[PDB]
Amino acid sequence: AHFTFQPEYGQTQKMNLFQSVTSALDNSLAKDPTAVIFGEDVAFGGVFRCTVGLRDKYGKDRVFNTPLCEQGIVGFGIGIAVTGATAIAEIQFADYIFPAFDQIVNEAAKYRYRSGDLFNCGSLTIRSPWGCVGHGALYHSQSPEAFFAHCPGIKVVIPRSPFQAKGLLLSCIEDKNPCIFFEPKILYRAAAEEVPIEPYNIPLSQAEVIQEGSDVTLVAWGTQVHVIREVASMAKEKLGVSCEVIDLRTIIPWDVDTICKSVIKTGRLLISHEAPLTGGFASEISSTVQEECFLNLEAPISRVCGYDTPFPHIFEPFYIPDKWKCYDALRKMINY
Template sequence: MGLEAEYSRERVFNTPLCEQGLVGFGIGMAAMGHTAIAEVQFADYILPAYDQIVNEAAKYNYRSGGQHSAGKLTIRAPCMGVGHGALYHSQSVEQLFMGVPGLKVVIPRSPIQAKGLLLSSIRDPDPVIFLEPKILYRSSVEHCPVDDFTLPLSSAEILTPGKDLTLISYGAPLYTCAQAIEMLRNPSSTISAHISPHLRTASIELIDLRTILPWDRETVVESVRKTGRCVIVHEAPVTAGVGAEISAHVQKEAFLNLEAPVERVGGWDTPFPHVHESFYKPGPTRILDALVRTLTY
């Protein structure tokens, strides 16, 4: 708010609601050396611009042999479910970009993370897709520093250390993962009343990926080698999701350390529903079940 008044309409302006056009415009600005931040109002509507992003922005540096680049382009887009967005306003599209060399994909979990990661994205030499979980706009509160600061891209953060299981997520589902861990430890919870007492003392290592392309393989593999168990959570469908890529790499690099199959918890393989979004998204009960299955395998 107030950006146009502070920086003028020369730098801050609305565009027509044409995603292919506004992203293409941003690529052109970046190619000319300007810093361009393009906002797609909902990540669901980034698909008309998919050709521009994949075939132009991501390849511009490579195809010119490093002479030209669209690396000064950052594309912001709200993503994930908000409770009433339905099939065109609640989708998670990050997995559509995981196989695109030349891009970076970042998803913050909180205001401080959003500011530090966004400033890093804007200054990064590669074009960045910056996906903001929309449900956190009004539910995630922090005292965010007003000073300029950055947080490293492609560097996962261990939120709670542990030794018995590695729980991996990013964005809004991290808070649901924390709920599931609390339910596991809480004997008074009716949902988890059946859980054996020895499981309640399990030490869970919760990791926020922050960047999913390229993701922090070293931190994840080191954690799984230590714990021997791994659960991955995301809102996007399980099939061909972020969890599929991570689990494939984990079993390759930490196969001899695994005590259980890598478990994935995600959205169902259906379009995002019109109603009952909470039944589609991975809730704390589904995550808790995955933790128990993995710990007791």
């Protein structure tokens, strides 16, 4: 495997990432009688087991399958949300969110603005599996966040662990803006840790510094956080370099202030993501940090990303911005 998963709110119990999603969903339906969950295949628990037992607990009118039509799922979701009911839609793989692109970008994101706040779909959240999975190839691997980041009016949120997932998903569900929640599917069974049983929230648009450091700032999100955490340990051991490791968490609106504050301290920045380099969200972080931190930057900002290709099947080990690719770029940046 290319990563290793590692690491106050009442009683907790061991949950993997898919279980933490179920727990968020369950807490949500318990609290909010309007809330419904729907998608292609959610009734009997879903492909990744994220909705197991919810239909039996809450009823077939609240946890139900739609026809196989992503554009419809999102339009339908918008519609529910227009009435003020909580609509939690699932798109089975992030790769299949594109048929819904018009409903998300032209409709959901602009609903409140274009009406003068006479109507909104703030109570919509779209959750979807995301990211590489070892053998997903072109259409079961994709990381579409950069496409959505260029759309004012939506939020895009990506967690790194079961604890982070449940808190961030609850915040999306309760946030008064349409939210896309991308669940890193490679962690569904892999990452396991103590998760509060009862509801809690983690704030949106707030990065998390998971490790303080002084020579360089490392930024990623989802699974890639675990990669840069390892890269930090590699850098300490092999180079004597102290790395500050940051999980962005919310892609838009993003926490410009946390990232810039870190870079003022360290003077160097490397951003990593699985998505292709060109047009990827690392460009927006790099360009912003450069504007705000120009007098502190001792070296060019590094982007260690996927190549500008579709996501391959057999070649995945060579495609992904793994710990060695990140480490080598970090080394070169430190030597600058």
